[PDB]
């Protein structure tokens, strides 16, 4: 487990998604160092110019990356997981337009913690925040609110995303979090408050996102 | 639910048996009162003498007959899974000999509450207690402890039943039970203590045991 997170580990993220029918992908490649809670990463869009905003990816774009104070080290779900992982799936309900429904694996590939996820988005509309590309390439700080469910041995986690609109109006984006594992641990209420930059490599010429990352968890 | 156990309600009981490949069926018809806890019932062999001694039926052979007392009302699973039903499923260990398994439907069809039974029993020795049948006519009294698992939404019971043996000594059976309904009611520990009696119809000529019971429910 968290035996894995001392000192900086590699990454690798990949995301197979359609929205409305617009495939694409995004692959990935950065590193993370949970003892301070750092992601620094560079997305590419392989397929060409997103169908979507880019700010609407980054949450299905590790949270095994937090960093859990020393007197919260009994509720640190994602990390006792590893390195045999665990499965996160969302719903993610956009106000007013469509939603998105993702399935993805996490878990250690030799030395390189890999994310593979899977995005199916709906009912979207045009001339609509998300597809009109209306959104501001920002990433505002946000808690994210974990309980335990026993049952499913994993835990459920809930948030909602306030994106910038250009229009100077918010994109709300509900986020509905299931996670079960691939010997085991449960946490109490907590929540992990996150802050994100947002910024592009220049001499990059690919649709493209550079990312970057600090979480810590928190409320005990 | 408890609506309908109030008063007097028939009863009718089937047993699908096979032991060691010796194979068999029960057929019971009575009634039973809820609301003093009293069962009277009449057990017939039909497919000739039975394989194994009555007293070792006598469990897998309507809870839900037990007289909850009004400071316990909230903690009748039984009752509250009615009329649509519970399914029941045992597993019992007899000591130094074989085991059964049960799994059973309890039902109300038209007025009478039905229980229909499936029973598998493996690896018992002949000279043993069970097909040597070495058992007194007996049972005496015993305490059924409950617990409610919320996951399965309903409850598990274990207990072990002392049977009397000709010998002067006792043959035990280790219970195991799982209860799970076919709106909802869920149980704190209690305990349901029994007691049993044991005879025949005079005037009968096939196979068959008549049974008598009090059941009340206990412990808060």
Chains 1, 2 share one sequence.
Request: charged residues 25%; hydrophobic residues 35%.
């Amino acid at each position: 487990g968290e035996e894995l997170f001392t000192g900086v580990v590699p990454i690798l993220i990949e995301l197979d998604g359609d929205v409305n029918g617009h495939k694409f992908f995004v692959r990935g490649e950065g590193e993370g160092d949970a003892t301070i809670g750092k992601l620094s990463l560079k997305f590419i869009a392989t397929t060409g110019k997103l169908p979507v905003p880019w700010p609407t990816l980054v949450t299905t774009l590790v949270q095994a990356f937090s960093r859990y104070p020393d007197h919260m080290k009994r509720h640190d779900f994602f990390k006792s997981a590893m390195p045999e992982g665990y499965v996160q799936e969302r719903t993610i309900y956009f106000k007013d337009d469509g939603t998105y429904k993702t399935r993805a694996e996490v878990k250690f590939e030799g030395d390189t913690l890999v994310n593979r996820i899977e995005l199916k988005g709906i009912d979207f509309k045009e001339d609509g925040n998300i597809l009109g590309h209306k959104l501001e390439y920002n990433f505002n700080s946000h808690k994210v609110y974990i309980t335990a469910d026993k049952c499913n041995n994993g835990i459920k986690a809930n948030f909602t995303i306030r994106h910038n609109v250009e229009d100077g109006s918010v994109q709300l984006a509900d986020h509905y979090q299931q996670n079960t594992p691939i010997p085991v641990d449960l946490p109490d209420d907590h929540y992990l408050s996150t802050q994100t930059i947002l910024s592009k490599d220049l001499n990059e010429k690919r649709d493209h996102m550079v990312l970057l990352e600090y979480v810590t968890a928190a409320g005990i």
